[PDB]
């Protein structure tokens, strides 16, 4: 049965070669409008639990170069620091310009982002977006 | 029900959006060791039948660029095949899984073209992601045995 689950891990593979940071995640909206993990590596189960209900959201990247110099809640923040995360990249996934979810990169030390990384990161998010668009779609259609 | 002909089409989507070239394709090895189109746009079938075979490589592969066909190292026949298709420039990016060549994906340009570092980086990125998508997706199909 259809495994975009294999595409998610593939993308996690590609993120870690392409962008050489310590962990990564993919999340997508559920019907409630809340972002949910569909794929991770290697953030712990304890962190993903803490955070699952909480992030979002015209669709552009977001970079926390240091969680300290960062306007988060002290609640959310100790979760992040607790996991051993010092920096974060948020990268939108879209269909038809609809925000559909995001992927995330995580760093143990603070981090500044090159144009080249951001570019690769954007190309990754582009492909996932289309992968999900096409896999979802004609599984919708291989029915009618 | 491996319709990840959808992974191929998505890739072709990403190739177009990330690299603004004129045409693109994916080719994979077959059991005779020969390279074979598995997806493309807008190459013609005539072209595709025409040029199966050549694998610019044979254990540690880099991208190959051809900025002007007229200035490339091609046998008469194979240069005639490209130009008659209407192509002037091409990019070969190896597809690799577990440290081995499995295929390639190609960007084509109808007029000469110098390859900007940025687009090379983008292209490589996509080439990794195809590799990995293939690695994992047939891995799943095989597992179920």
């Amino acid at each position: 049965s259809n495994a975009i689950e294999e595409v998610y891990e593939a993308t996690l593979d590609a993120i870690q070669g392409a962008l050489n940071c310590d962990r990564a995640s993919i999340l997508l909206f559920d019907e409630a409008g809340t972002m949910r993990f569909v794929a991770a590596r290697g953030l712990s189960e304890h962190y993903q639990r803490a955070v699952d209900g909480h992030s979002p959201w015209e669709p552009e990247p977001i970079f926390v170069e240091n969680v300290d110099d960062a306007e988060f809640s002290r609640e959310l923040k100790e979760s992040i620091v607790g996991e051993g995360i010092a920096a974060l990249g948020f990268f939108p996934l879209v269909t038809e310009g609809r925000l559909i979810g995001k992927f995330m990169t995580y760093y143990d030390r603070p981090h500044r982002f090159a144009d080249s990384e951001i570019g690769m990161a954007l190309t990754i998010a582009r492909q996932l977006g289309f992968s999900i668009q096409r896999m979802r779609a004609e599984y919708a259609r291989r029915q009618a």
Side-chain angles (χ1 to χ4, degrees), chain A residues 1-73 75-140 143-144:
Chain A
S1 265
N2 81 162
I4 61 171
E5 183 65 13
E6 295 302 320
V7 159
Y8 301 151
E9 295 305 312
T11 298
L12 295 174
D13 298 325
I15 287 161
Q16 293 177 335
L19 311 176
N20 308 131
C21 63
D22 289 345
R23 18 272 186 77
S25 57
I26 306 163
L27 305 91
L28 300 169
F29 280 121
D30 54 26
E31 301 296 314
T34 89
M35 287 264 71
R36 297 270 168 209
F37 287 103
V38 324
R41 183 167 308 159
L43 319 160
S44 65
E45 295 302 320
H46 181 316
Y47 171 82
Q48 293 177 335
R49 270 192 306 263
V51 159
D52 209 18
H54 319 70
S55 291
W57 58 279
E58 193 287 84
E60 260 194 353
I62 282 72
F63 316 98
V64 168
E65 303 184 342
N66 193 350
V67 292
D68 289 345
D69 297 23
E71 270 149 356
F72 290 121
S73 91
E75 293 177 350
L76 177 63
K77 186 173 295 162
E78 63 185 342
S79 313
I80 296 178
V81 311
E83 184 54 12
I85 300 155
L88 296 188
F90 306 83
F91 301 91
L93 307 176
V94 175
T95 293
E96 244 70 51
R98 267 175 63 248
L99 177 63
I100 294 169
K102 65 181 162 205
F103 91 81
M104 301 221 264
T105 56
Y106 304 89
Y107 305 78
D108 299 326
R109 293 182 183 174
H111 187 261
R112 291 193 297 274
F113 300 78
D115 291 344
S116 53
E117 293 177 350
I118 294 166
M120 298 175 317
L122 300 166
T123 315
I124 300 180
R126 233 193 247 281
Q127 191 132 93
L128 177 63
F130 285 124
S131 296
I132 297 157
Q133 186 173 355
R134 285 169 169 292
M135 290 198 267
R136 195 196 225 303
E138 67 79 65
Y139 164 108
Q143 324 284 73

Coordinates of all heavy atoms in Angstrom, one line a residue, chain A residues 36-102, unseen atoms left out:
Chain A
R36 N 1.5 18.4 12.5 CA 1.8 17.1 13.1 C 3.0 16.4 12.5 O 3.2 16.5 11.2 CB 0.7 16.1 12.7 CG -0.6 16.5 13.2 CD -0.8 15.9 14.6 NE -1.9 16.5 15.2 CZ -2.1 16.6 16.5 NH1 -1.2 16.1 17.3 NH2 -3.2 17.2 16.9
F37 N 3.9 15.8 13.2 CA 5.1 15.1 12.7 C 4.6 14.0 11.8 O 3.9 13.2 12.3 CB 6.0 14.5 13.8 CG 6.7 15.5 14.6 CD1 6.3 15.9 15.9 CD2 7.9 16.1 14.1 CE1 7.0 16.8 16.6 CE2 8.5 17.1 14.8 CZ 8.1 17.4 16.1
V38 N 5.1 13.9 10.6 CA 4.9 12.7 9.8 C 6.2 11.9 9.6 O 6.2 10.8 9.2 CB 4.1 12.9 8.4 CG1 3.1 14.0 8.6 CG2 5.0 13.3 7.3
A39 N 7.4 12.4 10.1 CA 8.7 11.9 9.8 C 9.7 12.6 10.7 O 9.6 13.8 10.9 CB 9.1 12.1 8.4
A40 N 10.6 11.9 11.3 CA 11.7 12.5 12.1 C 13.0 11.7 12.0 O 13.1 10.6 11.6 CB 11.2 12.7 13.5
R41 N 14.1 12.4 12.4 CA 15.4 11.7 12.6 C 16.2 12.8 13.2 O 15.9 14.0 12.9 CB 15.9 11.5 11.2 CG 17.2 10.8 11.1 CD 17.6 10.3 9.8 NE 16.5 9.6 9.2 CZ 16.3 9.4 7.9 NH1 17.2 9.9 7.1 NH2 15.3 8.7 7.5
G42 N 17.1 12.5 14.2 CA 16.8 11.7 15.3 C 16.6 12.8 16.3 O 17.6 13.3 17.0
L43 N 15.4 13.3 16.4 CA 14.8 13.9 17.6 C 14.2 12.8 18.3 O 13.7 11.9 17.7 CB 13.7 14.9 17.2 CG 13.7 15.8 16.0 CD1 12.3 16.2 15.7 CD2 14.6 17.0 16.4
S44 N 14.2 12.9 19.6 CA 13.7 11.8 20.5 C 12.2 11.7 20.6 O 11.5 12.6 20.3 CB 14.3 12.0 21.8 OG 13.7 13.2 22.4
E45 N 11.7 10.6 21.0 CA 10.2 10.5 21.2 C 9.8 11.5 22.3 O 8.8 12.1 22.2 CB 9.9 9.1 21.6 CG 10.2 8.1 20.5 CD 9.4 8.4 19.2 OE1 8.2 8.8 19.3 OE2 10.0 8.3 18.1
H46 N 10.6 11.6 23.3 CA 10.3 12.6 24.3 C 10.1 14.1 23.8 O 9.2 14.8 24.1 CB 11.3 12.6 25.5 CG 11.0 13.6 26.6 ND1 10.6 14.9 26.3 CD2 11.0 13.5 27.9 CE1 10.3 15.5 27.4 NE2 10.6 14.7 28.4
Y47 N 11.0 14.5 22.9 CA 10.8 15.9 22.3 C 9.6 15.9 21.4 O 8.9 16.9 21.5 CB 12.1 16.3 21.5 CG 11.9 17.5 20.7 CD1 12.0 18.8 21.3 CD2 11.6 17.5 19.3 CE1 11.8 20.0 20.5 CE2 11.4 18.6 18.6 CZ 11.5 19.8 19.1 OH 11.3 21.0 18.3
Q48 N 9.4 14.9 20.6 CA 8.3 15.0 19.6 C 7.0 15.0 20.3 O 6.1 15.7 19.8 CB 8.3 13.8 18.6 CG 9.5 13.8 17.6 CD 9.5 12.5 16.8 OE1 8.9 11.5 17.1 NE2 10.0 12.6 15.6
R49 N 6.9 14.2 21.3 CA 5.7 14.3 22.2 C 5.5 15.7 22.7 O 4.5 16.4 22.3 CB 5.8 13.4 23.4 CG 5.3 12.0 23.2 CD 5.2 11.2 24.5 NE 6.5 11.1 25.2 CZ 7.4 10.1 25.2 NH1 7.2 9.0 24.5 NH2 8.5 10.3 26.0
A50 N 6.4 16.2 23.5 CA 6.4 17.6 24.0 C 5.7 18.6 22.9 O 4.8 19.3 23.2 CB 7.7 18.1 24.4
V51 N 6.3 18.5 21.7 CA 6.1 19.6 20.7 C 4.9 19.3 19.7 O 4.5 20.2 19.0 CB 7.4 19.8 19.9 CG1 7.1 20.5 18.6 CG2 8.4 20.6 20.8
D52 N 4.4 18.1 19.6 CA 3.6 17.7 18.5 C 2.5 18.7 18.1 O 2.2 18.9 17.0 CB 3.1 16.3 18.6 CG 2.8 15.7 17.2 OD1 3.4 16.2 16.2 OD2 2.1 14.6 17.1
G53 N 1.7 19.1 19.1 CA 0.6 20.0 18.8 C 1.0 21.4 18.4 O 0.2 22.1 17.7
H54 N 2.2 21.9 18.7 CA 2.5 23.3 18.6 C 3.1 24.5 17.9 O 2.9 25.6 18.3 CB 3.4 23.7 19.7 CG 2.9 23.1 21.0 ND1 3.0 21.8 21.3 CD2 2.3 23.7 22.1 CE1 2.5 21.6 22.5 NE2 2.1 22.7 23.0
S55 N 3.8 24.2 16.8 CA 4.3 25.3 15.9 C 3.8 26.5 15.1 O 3.9 27.6 15.5 CB 4.6 24.1 15.0 OG 5.6 23.3 15.6
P56 N 3.1 26.1 14.0 CA 3.1 27.0 12.7 C 3.8 28.4 12.6 O 4.5 28.7 13.5 CB 1.5 27.1 12.4 CG 0.8 26.7 13.7 CD 1.8 25.7 14.4
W57 N 3.6 29.2 11.6 CA 3.0 29.0 10.3 C 4.0 29.2 9.2 O 3.9 30.0 8.3 CB 1.8 29.8 10.0 CG 2.0 31.4 10.0 CD1 2.0 32.2 11.1 CD2 2.1 32.3 8.8 NE1 2.1 33.5 10.7 CE2 2.2 33.6 9.3 CE3 2.1 32.1 7.4 CZ2 2.3 34.7 8.4 CZ3 2.3 33.2 6.6 CH2 2.4 34.5 7.1
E58 N 3.4 35.4 3.6 CA 3.1 34.5 2.5 C 4.3 33.4 2.3 O 5.4 33.8 1.8 CB 2.8 35.2 1.2 CG 2.3 34.2 0.1 CD 3.3 33.2 -0.5 OE1 3.6 32.1 0.0 OE2 3.8 33.6 -1.6
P59 N 4.1 32.1 2.6 CA 5.1 31.1 2.8 C 6.5 31.4 2.5 O 6.9 31.4 1.4 CB 4.6 30.0 1.9 CG 3.0 30.1 1.9 CD 2.7 31.5 2.5
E60 N 7.3 31.6 3.6 CA 8.8 31.8 3.4 C 9.5 31.1 4.5 O 9.0 30.8 5.6 CB 9.1 33.2 3.4 CG 9.4 33.8 1.9 CD 10.1 35.1 1.9 OE1 10.2 35.7 3.0 OE2 10.4 35.6 0.8
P61 N 10.8 30.8 4.3 CA 11.7 30.2 5.3 C 11.7 31.0 6.6 O 11.4 32.2 6.6 CB 13.0 30.1 4.7 CG 12.8 30.1 3.3 CD 11.5 30.8 3.0
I62 N 12.1 30.4 7.7 CA 12.3 31.0 9.0 C 13.6 30.4 9.5 O 13.8 29.2 9.4 CB 11.2 30.7 10.0 CG1 10.0 31.6 9.6 CG2 11.6 31.0 11.4 CD1 9.3 31.2 8.4
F63 N 14.5 31.2 10.1 CA 15.7 30.7 10.7 C 15.9 31.2 12.1 O 15.9 32.3 12.3 CB 16.9 31.1 9.8 CG 16.7 31.0 8.3 CD1 16.4 32.1 7.6 CD2 16.9 29.8 7.7 CE1 16.2 32.1 6.2 CE2 16.8 29.7 6.3 CZ 16.4 30.8 5.6
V64 N 16.0 30.3 13.1 CA 16.5 30.6 14.4 C 18.0 30.3 14.4 O 18.3 29.1 14.6 CB 15.6 30.0 15.5 CG1 16.3 30.2 16.9 CG2 14.2 30.7 15.5
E65 N 18.8 31.3 14.3 CA 20.3 31.1 14.4 C 20.7 30.8 15.8 O 21.8 30.3 16.0 CB 21.0 32.3 13.8 CG 20.5 32.5 12.3 CD 21.2 33.6 11.6 OE1 21.8 34.5 12.2 OE2 21.1 33.6 10.3
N66 N 19.9 31.3 16.8 CA 20.1 30.8 18.1 C 18.8 31.0 19.0 O 18.3 32.1 19.2 CB 21.2 31.6 18.8 CG 21.6 31.0 20.2 OD1 20.9 30.1 20.7 ND2 22.7 31.5 20.7
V67 N 18.3 29.8 19.5 CA 17.1 29.8 20.3 C 17.2 30.8 21.5 O 16.1 31.3 21.9 CB 16.7 28.4 20.9 CG1 16.3 27.4 19.8 CG2 17.8 27.7 21.7
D68 N 18.3 31.1 22.0 CA 18.4 32.2 23.1 C 18.0 33.5 22.5 O 16.9 34.0 22.9 CB 19.8 32.3 23.6 CG 20.2 31.1 24.5 OD1 19.3 30.4 24.9 OD2 21.4 30.9 24.7
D69 N 18.7 34.0 21.5 CA 18.3 35.2 20.8 C 17.0 34.9 20.0 O 17.0 35.2 18.8 CB 19.4 35.7 19.9 CG 20.7 36.1 20.6 OD1 20.9 35.7 21.8 OD2 21.5 36.9 20.1
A70 N 16.0 34.4 20.7 CA 14.8 33.9 20.0 C 13.6 34.1 20.8 O 13.5 33.7 21.9 CB 15.0 32.4 19.6
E71 N 12.5 34.6 20.1 CA 11.3 34.9 20.8 C 10.3 33.7 20.8 O 9.4 33.6 20.0 CB 10.6 36.2 20.1 CG 11.0 37.6 20.7 CD 11.0 38.7 19.7 OE1 10.8 38.5 18.5 OE2 11.3 39.9 20.0
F72 N 10.7 32.8 21.7 CA 9.8 31.6 21.9 C 9.2 31.7 23.3 O 9.7 32.6 24.1 CB 10.6 30.3 21.9 CG 11.1 29.9 20.5 CD1 12.4 29.7 20.2 CD2 10.2 29.7 19.4 CE1 12.9 29.3 19.0 CE2 10.6 29.3 18.2 CZ 12.0 29.1 17.9
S73 N 8.3 30.9 23.6 CA 7.8 30.7 25.0 C 8.9 30.0 25.8 O 9.7 29.3 25.2 CB 6.5 29.9 25.0 OG 6.7 28.5 25.2
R74 N 9.0 30.3 27.1 CA 9.9 29.5 28.0 C 9.4 28.1 28.1 O 10.2 27.2 28.4 CB 10.0 30.2 29.4
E75 N 8.1 27.8 27.9 CA 7.6 26.4 27.8 C 8.2 25.7 26.6 O 9.1 24.8 26.8 CB 6.1 26.5 27.7 CG 5.3 27.0 29.0 CD 3.8 27.1 28.8 OE1 3.4 26.9 27.6 OE2 3.1 27.3 29.8
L76 N 7.8 26.1 25.4 CA 8.4 25.6 24.2 C 9.9 25.6 24.3 O 10.5 24.6 23.8 CB 7.9 26.5 23.1 CG 8.5 26.1 21.7 CD1 8.1 24.7 21.4 CD2 8.3 27.1 20.6
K77 N 10.5 26.6 24.8 CA 12.0 26.8 24.7 C 12.7 25.7 25.5 O 13.7 25.2 25.0 CB 12.4 28.2 25.1 CG 13.9 28.5 24.9 CD 14.4 30.0 25.1 CE 13.7 31.0 24.1 NZ 13.7 32.5 24.6
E78 N 12.3 25.4 26.7 CA 13.0 24.4 27.5 C 12.9 23.1 26.8 O 13.8 22.3 26.8 CB 12.9 24.4 29.0 CG 11.5 24.2 29.6 CD 11.6 24.3 31.1 OE1 12.7 24.3 31.7 OE2 10.5 24.5 31.7
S79 N 11.8 22.8 26.1 CA 11.7 21.6 25.3 C 12.8 21.5 24.3 O 13.5 20.5 24.2 CB 10.3 21.4 24.5 OG 9.2 21.7 25.3
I80 N 13.0 22.6 23.6 CA 14.0 22.7 22.5 C 15.4 22.6 23.1 O 16.2 21.8 22.7 CB 14.0 24.1 21.8 CG1 12.7 24.3 21.1 CG2 15.1 24.1 20.8 CD1 12.5 25.6 20.4
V81 N 15.7 23.4 24.2 CA 17.0 23.3 24.8 C 17.2 22.0 25.4 O 18.2 21.4 25.3 CB 17.2 24.5 25.8 CG1 16.8 25.8 25.2 CG2 16.4 24.2 27.0
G82 N 16.1 21.4 26.0 CA 16.1 20.1 26.6 C 16.6 19.0 25.7 O 17.3 18.1 26.1
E83 N 16.2 19.0 24.4 CA 16.5 18.1 23.3 C 18.0 18.2 22.9 O 18.5 17.3 22.3 CB 15.6 18.3 22.2 CG 15.7 17.3 21.0 CD 15.7 15.8 21.4 OE1 15.3 15.5 22.5 OE2 16.0 14.9 20.6
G84 N 18.5 19.4 23.1 CA 19.9 19.7 22.8 C 20.0 20.5 21.5 O 21.1 20.4 20.8
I85 N 19.0 21.3 21.2 CA 18.9 22.1 19.9 C 19.2 23.5 20.2 O 18.7 24.1 21.1 CB 17.4 22.0 19.4 CG1 17.0 20.6 19.1 CG2 17.3 22.8 18.1 CD1 15.6 20.3 19.2
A86 N 20.2 24.1 19.5 CA 20.6 25.5 19.5 C 20.2 26.3 18.4 O 20.4 27.6 18.4 CB 22.1 25.5 19.6
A87 N 19.7 25.7 17.3 CA 19.3 26.5 16.1 C 18.4 25.7 15.2 O 18.4 24.4 15.1 CB 20.6 26.9 15.3
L88 N 17.6 26.4 14.3 CA 16.5 25.8 13.6 C 16.2 26.5 12.3 O 16.2 27.7 12.2 CB 15.2 26.0 14.4 CG 15.3 25.2 15.7 CD1 14.0 25.1 16.5 CD2 15.8 23.8 15.3
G89 N 16.0 25.6 11.3 CA 15.5 26.1 10.0 C 14.1 25.6 9.7 O 13.9 24.4 9.7
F90 N 13.2 26.5 9.4 CA 11.9 26.1 9.0 C 11.6 26.3 7.5 O 11.8 27.4 7.1 CB 10.9 27.0 9.7 CG 11.1 27.0 11.2 CD1 12.0 27.9 11.8 CD2 10.3 26.2 12.0 CE1 12.2 27.9 13.2 CE2 10.4 26.3 13.4 CZ 11.4 27.1 14.0
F91 N 11.2 25.3 6.8 CA 11.1 25.4 5.4 C 9.7 24.9 4.9 O 9.4 23.7 5.0 CB 12.1 24.5 4.7 CG 13.5 24.9 5.0 CD1 14.2 24.3 6.1 CD2 14.2 25.8 4.3 CE1 15.5 24.7 6.5 CE2 15.4 26.2 4.6 CZ 16.1 25.7 5.7
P92 N 8.9 25.8 4.4 CA 7.6 25.5 3.9 C 7.4 24.5 2.8 O 8.2 24.5 1.9 CB 7.0 26.9 3.4 CG 8.1 27.9 3.7 CD 9.1 27.3 4.6
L93 N 6.3 23.8 2.9 CA 5.8 22.9 1.9 C 4.5 23.4 1.4 O 3.7 23.7 2.3 CB 5.7 21.5 2.4 CG 6.8 20.8 3.1 CD1 6.4 19.4 3.6 CD2 8.1 20.6 2.2
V94 N 4.3 23.4 0.1 CA 3.1 24.1 -0.5 C 2.5 23.3 -1.7 O 3.2 22.5 -2.4 CB 3.6 25.4 -1.1 CG1 2.5 26.1 -1.8 CG2 4.2 26.3 0.0
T95 N 1.2 23.4 -1.9 CA 0.6 22.9 -3.2 C -0.3 24.0 -3.8 O -1.2 24.4 -3.1 CB -0.3 21.8 -3.0 OG1 0.5 20.6 -2.6 CG2 -1.0 21.4 -4.3
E96 N 0.0 24.4 -5.0 CA -0.8 25.5 -5.5 C -0.6 26.8 -4.6 O -1.6 27.5 -4.4 CB -2.3 25.1 -5.5 CG -2.8 25.0 -6.9 CD -2.3 23.8 -7.7 OE1 -2.3 22.7 -7.2 OE2 -1.8 24.1 -8.9
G97 N 0.6 27.0 -4.2 CA 0.9 28.0 -3.1 C 0.1 28.0 -1.8 O 0.2 28.9 -1.0
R98 N -0.6 26.8 -1.5 CA -1.1 26.6 -0.2 C -0.1 26.0 0.7 O 0.4 24.9 0.4 CB -2.3 25.5 -0.2 CG -3.7 26.0 -0.3 CD -4.6 24.8 -0.4 NE -4.6 24.0 0.8 CZ -4.1 22.7 0.9 NH1 -3.6 22.1 -0.2 NH2 -4.1 22.1 2.1
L99 N 0.1 26.6 1.9 CA 0.9 26.0 2.9 C 0.2 24.7 3.4 O -0.9 24.7 3.8 CB 1.0 27.0 4.0 CG 1.8 26.5 5.3 CD1 3.2 26.2 4.9 CD2 1.7 27.4 6.5
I100 N 1.0 23.6 3.3 CA 0.5 22.2 3.5 C 1.3 21.6 4.7 O 0.9 20.7 5.3 CB 0.7 21.5 2.2 CG1 -0.2 22.1 1.2 CG2 0.7 20.0 2.3 CD1 0.2 21.6 -0.3
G101 N 2.4 22.2 5.0 CA 3.2 21.8 6.1 C 4.6 22.4 6.0 O 4.8 23.3 5.2
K102 N 5.6 21.8 6.6 CA 6.9 22.3 6.6 C 7.9 21.2 6.8 O 7.5 20.1 7.4 CB 7.2 23.3 7.7 CG 7.1 22.7 9.1 CD 7.3 23.9 10.2 CE 6.8 23.5 11.6 NZ 6.5 24.7 12.3

